[PDB]
Design a protein around this ligand. Sequence first.
Ligand SMILES: OC[C@H]1O[C@@H](O)[C@H](O)[C@@H](O)[C@H]1O
Ligand SMILES: [Ca+2]
Length: 137
Amino acid sequence: IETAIPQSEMTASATSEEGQDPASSAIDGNINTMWHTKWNGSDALPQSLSVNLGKARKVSSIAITPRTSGNNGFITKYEIHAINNGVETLVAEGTWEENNLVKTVTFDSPIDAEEIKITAIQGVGGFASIAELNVYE
Ligand SMILES: OC[C@H]1O[C@@H](O)[C@H](O)[C@@H](O)[C@H]1O
Ligand SMILES: [Ca+2]
């Protein structure tokens, strides 16, 4: 048993976004639209995407769907922080491969969080992109 938090209950924000690729496009249920930092490369990494969850949640996993086409912004090095009451705390970090496969992060002990922040430390082309982000309880 695991349950998907409705993305419609989420709101998204990013420190860098191309006009065509806003933070909100990371949570619209469409793998053809992405969040992407600004194409002109002016916002050097790290850049981040914050997703507010709507209420206090107990999250057991996160699925990070890369762009369905192209490679620019495949995140290769990341951090994940959670915001709860309203303390911010580092909860995941590592390296991801250079491909378009969904990247999962699982919490054996489910974490309390009202908001999650994905920080892209390194990414291809010096960009960060996420086509879809889902959060599971
Ligand atoms: O300049 C950066 C841009 O490059 C394009 O080729 C790509 O389709 C966009 O997603 C964006 O990454
Ligand atoms: Ca999307």
